[PDB]
Design a protein around this ligand. Structure first.
Ligand SMILES: O=C(NCC(F)(F)F)c1ccon1
Length: 330
């Protein structure tokens, strides 16, 4: 089997992407944030504290003839950005782009943190990291991909995120019309439960390529590109007036600037992030200080190839017995 679904930016900055997902019988369609950096499929629901729901579409398990309470199961997750959610668990039928999994753990939120409430466009998350990170207790549950894998034509999914435009998540096949040149594959460590890999280096603008190993995660659920302080300083040094602002929470730059591109290495191949992709706009409405899309990972403990990097590529998440990651230009 295969599936194919369009993913759409939630706003004009590409802060995140939402993909429609059918849950239950009859189908209830929710717009979920597909997140290769976590492993829980959780939704706003009829059980979510009412004051914490503000415009989201909710899943109502009592209206699904295929929903079953997973007795005794609870979940609770905290994300790298400080947000969180928790609740109980149903199993139900879940379909993405024509691909159906029966008995998928659908984690129903009883509580969500303010950042989730405040984002009316995201109805929940669909985790696509390794199932070892799933938070359901006392019986850990499998991701949608993990459940679908054996049925797929090929044990893969691909992310093709757009810049200020829709893109595609495919399951079970590689669309050879969606990229240019060849796909370069690179090794993955699953030891921390992430799609963790090692970039071979970087360049800033038209500058020379620096060969250096940068370990990090391919994370569709993180907006920005978080890299070591040395690398990030070298980038922003090429933008007149750019500076790190402790009050704002990262590098900012004059909105009048033209940003240089940023290149990252995948083996001997190179992915070029255009300068425009690194502009996240005014820090507050009307400001002439703009927020940068490349930021230091120093406070985080891990480097993160988030949407800024991934949307410059066609990315293959290869879930074969030994997982790997593939990147192509597009
Ligand atoms: O925050 C999470 N993932 C995104 C991160 F890697 F950037 F942190 C998370 C929470 C539970 O499992 N993973």
């Amino acid at each position: 089997s295969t599936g194919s679904a369009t993913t759409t930016p939630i706003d004009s900055l590409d802060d995140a992407y939402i993909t429609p997902v059918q849950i239950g019988t009859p189908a209830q369609t929710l717009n979920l944030d597909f997140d290769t950096g976590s492993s829980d499929l959780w939704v706003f629901s009829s059980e979510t504290t009412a004051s914490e729901v503000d415009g989201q579409t909710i899943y109502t398990p009592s209206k699904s003839t295929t929903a079953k309470l997973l007795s005794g199961a609870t979940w609770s997750i905290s994300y790298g950005d400080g947000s969180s959610s928790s609740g109980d668990v149903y199993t139900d039928t879940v379909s993405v782009g024509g691909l159906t999994v029966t008995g998928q753990a659908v984690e129903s939120a009883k509580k969500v943190s303010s950042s989730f409430t405040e984002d009316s466009t995201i109805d929940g998350l669909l985790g696509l990291a390794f199932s070892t990170l799933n938070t359901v207790s006392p019986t850990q549950q499998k991701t949608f991909f993990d459940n679908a894998k054996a049925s797929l034509d090929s044990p893969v999914f691909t992310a093709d995120l757009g810049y200020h435009a829709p893109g595609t998540y495919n399951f079970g096949f590689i669309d050879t019309t969606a990229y240019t040149g060849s796909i370069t594959y690179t090794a993955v460590s699953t030891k921390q439960g992430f799609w963790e890999w090692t970039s071979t280096g970087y360049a800033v603008g038209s500058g020379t390529f620096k060969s250096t190993s940068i370990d990090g995660i391919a994370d569709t659920g993180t907006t920005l590109l978080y890299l070591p302080a040395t690398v990030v300083s070298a980038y922003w040094a090429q933008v007149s007036g750019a500076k790190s602002s402790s009050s704002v929470g990262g590098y900012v730059f004059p909105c009048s600037a033209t940003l240089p591109s940023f290149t990252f290495g995948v083996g001997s191949a190179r992915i070029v992030i255009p300068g425009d992709y690194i502009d996240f706009g005014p820090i507050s409405t009307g400001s002439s200080s703009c927020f940068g899309g490349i930021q230091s990972s120093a406070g985080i403990g891990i480097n993160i190839f988030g949407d800024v990097a991934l949307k410059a590529a066609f990315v293959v998440f290869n879930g074969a017995t030994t997982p790997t990651l593939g990147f192509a230009s597009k």
